[PDB]
């Protein structure tokens, strides 16, 4: 009471769906205050070029945020600028290609933002 089906088709190149993005590490950025360098794998694109990527992030206990919905398919990093200082920051891209969306990657190790100022709280 799961499994579902509905025939087979056969017929030119097979539009399968990119993968999620592997190696999903994510560290601060050692030049840019208040940015940071998300880095991923290229995941399998799926008999069909990727289009774009959707790079969620979540804040402190916060939900997925659309942040980046156009990138670069052929881009395996990016740089979240306009950030908080002394908070945590997840980090969770998707492959997009013509076919459709596949999933994203594993929450990026708890990344945290270095404090800005006195200590608050």
Request: aromatic share 6%; with cysteine.
């Amino acid at each position: 009471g799961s499994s579902g089906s509905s025939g087979r088709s056969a017929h030119l190149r097979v539009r399968q769906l990119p993968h999620a993005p592997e190696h999903p590490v994510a560290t601060l950025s050692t030049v840019e205050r208040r940015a940071i360098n998300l880095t991923w794998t290229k995941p399998f694109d799926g008999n069909s070029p990727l289009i774009r990527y959707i790079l969620e992030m979540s804040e402190n206990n916060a939900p997925w945020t659309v942040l980046l919905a156009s990138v670069d398919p052929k881009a395996t990093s990016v740089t979240v600028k306009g950030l908080v200082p002394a908070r945590s920051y997840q980090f969770r891209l998707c492959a997009v290609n013509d076919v459709g969306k596949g999933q994203f990657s594993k929450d990026t190790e708890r990344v945290s933002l270095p404090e800005s100022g006195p200590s608050s709280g």
